[PDB]
Design a protein around this ligand. Structure first.
Ligand SMILES: C[C@@H](Oc1ccc(Cl)cc1Cl)C(=O)O
Ligand SMILES: C[C@@H](Oc1ccc(Cl)cc1Cl)C(=O)O
Ligand SMILES: C[C@@H](Oc1ccc(Cl)cc1Cl)C(=O)O
Ligand SMILES: C[C@@H](Oc1ccc(Cl)cc1Cl)C(=O)O
Ligand SMILES: O=C(O)CCC(=O)C(=O)O
Ligand SMILES: O=C(O)CCC(=O)C(=O)O
Ligand SMILES: O=C(O)CCC(=O)C(=O)O
Ligand SMILES: O=C(O)CCC(=O)C(=O)O
Ligand SMILES: [Cl-]
Ligand SMILES: [Cl-]
Ligand SMILES: [Cl-]
Ligand SMILES: [Cl-]
Ligand SMILES: [Co+2]
Ligand SMILES: [Co+2]
Ligand SMILES: [Co+2]
Ligand SMILES: [Co+2]
Lengths: 286, 286, 286, 286
């Protein structure tokens, strides 16, 4: 709109934008990179159709957003530790990775700031990714509700994904993309604010997710359950979401602090493979 | 035990006490009155079996607790505007008065401080009254949850009892004990703190009830519902309750700021009649 | 793929398809019509980008699906009582029409079978419509849960939209697209099965929606709320939805028996105008 | 009332009765035993104040109700395997036994029919036992709701009490009354009807409890959770309960099929000791 070096097409009135008119196989001039970063901060999830980039170009483009660092759970392609896989063979019957709303690796003291995902080979239909804005979840709380919860922190851990709760369950991820982890690493706790300030935009976002949040720190289990449940229902209303469909060589970047996302498992029996590099963040803070 | 002019038998480890060794038809000396008042403050609901008092002695004893003032909704006995009736004819099929956890007349800017209820004729069994302590409901919230809610206020009105919500439904009280009221008086709102300090003991109590609380002030309807539902489920756990069985001429006093009570409707087809005088309070405050 | 006279691009693995290779301004031969109808039955919501049709061609094409009959609540365009408007002026501050999951006019003894909606002028982004499959909501109930509910009926009425519950609240639709209605018509109840069989495909679908369903027939209010809340949370999981973005002259048909839909209100301050003709149905049945 | 050999004083209009005018240290003539059994079947929980019986008289009186057989979890007094203890030392800080609504040992293929509990040494106040009627929970379901759930079965196991869920938790029972159990015995599942017919009275009772019920058989976890939650809330309404206060040598009998009960933990710091013998039952059936 204001953009002169890239073409940007917002996806909904809440978040998401398609970006075209740029070739990510080539270096970006300063002005072009500035518009891309501005679109990233405005729209929170941006995607570029039709970008046939090499793995190393994927690494370098990811590096423009900040330091790259893989997440603990995913396997990487041979010869690139930074390039992890979200790969599901046609014949799998295991749990689909990321099939509840979450944001990535929040059990870390410093979760990722962003992730850059690229479609290698995906079905003609099925396997969309949903996103939602945690800026919008926060802004649509009343001032009274905001003031009530803004001093709270939450305890996060990977116990349901690769810790003792996981090991107690029957339903596994396959070993196609997921590593065997140490149970104790799965159960290690960290604490983050329930309401964070984005370190670049200064905007505030609600920060909780059902995959990694165990409870509100200092609360009883029943108090915490009641509050977190309301927040999850509030944040995942359909009005705050968008939905991204993938095609081969679509490159997408999401902000891992101010958004949540989830896989859509509607392609059972079909091969699906995307790669991703993760961009490191600093300690979430209030 | 520490009591030397009255005999006090606590009812549970949470609230409630029977008081004997005293004849309420006779004046009470300062020593005996000081212990009764102390037992009222410690136990929150106190009752005196076997007190065959006149209506005037009921008014005079009620007056020892504070100025007496009837509640808006109840009919009074002929010749005593201060002595109101909780009366249900055997064959009534209407709603049972007070059959949800509440405390009285909290839609008033200044609800009653206490009520003094006396059994005239009651069933051999059935018609007990439940009580619970809102001191205990407050004290068993975590320090974190207490800090989270202590600054909130709640909007109260009588809309479901004698205002527009009542008029919209089809389940009525009979005219045995309940007056016809103005709908606009039913709908008038007041605001009270969600957490109050008792003006005599200085102790804090949770202050919300599903009968008169409409919503948390300043919150959205979904936010208010979520928090108030948790607080009602928390406060009405069986562990925080006691149950009083009535016998003819039992006289009982409850603190209308720090308890809630409810009628038990398990005597359909049997006559029940109690009288009560209400003791005025000041504006609930933090 | 099996389609040889139209090109069909399914939208997700659950429901929804784009149809191209056809010009709806021209008559359709039997072969092309049979495939369109087949795609409508398989995919439940179908849409045709780029169809600059007249209002008469919109009526004629709608008529191929079944007899056309407007819904009670919407204003129609001058000169075409069958062509109703979903129109929102940029500066409206009123409630957004259809902004909760529902299916249309289910308070009728015989709700519509289908609707055909056409974009006249819509925002560059914002104003998408969500859809979900009630075939999928039904199929993913366990066999045990299916047997448990299949004999139940639900009482429907328009009370919250244009009856006494609507009149009691303070959030209105504007008069741009919505007629003034009789309150007694708003409150009139009908009964439908909770689980219906589609009269053409023979497949079964869950049939309840929070906008028009009042309660499960024969149940208490607390029993009905409990079951209907579970079914709404089950049916509206993100996995069962698809999301359609509009562009000028996109024409879309949805099956009003086996889907639910909702408006997304993310375009406040921007003009939006679609027209629709509704296709009459028969009484929903087991 | 009709009783001529015993004096019976019902406790509420729902369940419970005090029985006097009999000495349980002596054998009962046929007529006296017939009235006691009739009062047991009518009132579901009966209690006899002031019965200073020996352990063997307790055994023999229990034997009149049917075969005696201890429950798996509780320690017994030396020299009487049939006489188990519910004993809590003044200094305990562990979990209170039986502090949620339940009925006993329903993880067994044939749970107890009844239990006979006798106060040895109890506090002056605190440590009441609540009871409720599952006949009343069932009768207050609508016919429609009754027909909906009457064919369902439920899976029960002791996993939360002495199985893997217990071992996962932090909060233990003390070893004062509770035995060390095998985890596998804790996790063994059985199936009972959700609605049972009492084998003597022929009356129907709802049969589920949060302590031992894992899920509705054949349902998904979310479907089962939703239904069981509603039933627990419905059954434990205060209106369906009574509350029994203990005094030394009170002997009480409860029907373990048609009632639920729970301990009240309001006596922290005070010694409490009751003994009990359990009477074996047959397989719950519909
Ligand atoms: C890769 C990603 O891992 C998951 C996130 C959510 C869920 Cl449900 C499962 C996994 Cl493995 C992450 O958290 O970084
Ligand atoms: C007497 C009492 O009135 C009621 C309280 C609760 C309920 Cl559910 C009904 C009434 Cl009339 C009061 O609030 O003063
Ligand atoms: C046009 C449509 O009307 C509505 C549907 C849902 C809602 Cl929330 C509002 C309206 Cl006016 C209908 O039911 O036919
Ligand atoms: C003795 C009794 O055991 C319990 C019942 C409920 C609860 Cl919460 C705990 C126990 Cl040990 C039983 O089930 O037979
Ligand atoms: O497969 C997808 O769409 C998303 C998976 C995901 O959550 C992730 O990669 O962290
Ligand atoms: O009838 C009872 O037990 C209590 C009635 C009541 O709530 C009241 O008098 O305010
Ligand atoms: O405006 C929309 O997207 C849908 C409106 C709707 O629900 C309807 O026309 O019935
Ligand atoms: O201690 C009590 O009041 C009851 C304990 C109990 O549930 C039991 O003995 O099975
Ligand atoms: Cl390269
Ligand atoms: Cl006065
Ligand atoms: Cl027609
Ligand atoms: Cl003996
Ligand atoms: Co993820
Ligand atoms: Co009252
Ligand atoms: Co609609
Ligand atoms: Co027990």
């Amino acid at each position: 709109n204001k953009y002169r070096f890239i073409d940007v097409q917002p996806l909904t009135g809440v978040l998401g934008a398609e970006i075209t008119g740029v070739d990510l196989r080539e270096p970006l001039d300063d002005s072009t990179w500035n518009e891309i970063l501005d679109a990233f901060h405005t729209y929170q999830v941006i995607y570029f159709p039709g970008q046939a980039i090499t793995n190393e170009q994927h690494i370098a483009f990811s590096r423009r957003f900040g330091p790259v660092d893989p997440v603990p759970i995913l396997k990487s392609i041979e010869g690139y530790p930074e390039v992890q896989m979200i790969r599901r063979e046609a014949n799998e019957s295991s749990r689909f990775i990321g099939d509840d709303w979450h944001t990535d690796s929040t059990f870390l003291d410093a979760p990722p700031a962003a992730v850059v995902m690229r479609a290698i080979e995906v079905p003609e239909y099925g396997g969309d990714t949903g996103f939602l804005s945690m800026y919008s979840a926060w802004e649509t709380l009343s001032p009274t509700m905001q003031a009530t919860i803004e001093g709270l922190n939450v305890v996060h851990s990977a116990t349901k994904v690769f810790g003792s709760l996981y090991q107690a369950t029957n339903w596994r991820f396959s070993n196609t993309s997921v590593k065997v982890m140490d149970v104790d690493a799965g159960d290690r706790e960290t604490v983050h604010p329930l309401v964070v300030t984005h370190p670049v935009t200064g905007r505030r976002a609600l920060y909780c997710n059902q995959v990694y949040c165990q409870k509100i720190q200092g609360m009883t289990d029943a108090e915490s359950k009641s509050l977190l449940q309301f927040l999850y229902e509030h944040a995942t209303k359909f009005d705050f979401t968008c939905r991204v469909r993938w095609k081969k060589d679509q490159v997408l970047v999401w902000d891992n602090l101010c958004t949540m996302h989830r896989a859509v498992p509607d392609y059972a029996g079909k091969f699906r493979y995307l790669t991703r590099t993760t961009v490191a963040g600093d300690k979430p803070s209030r």
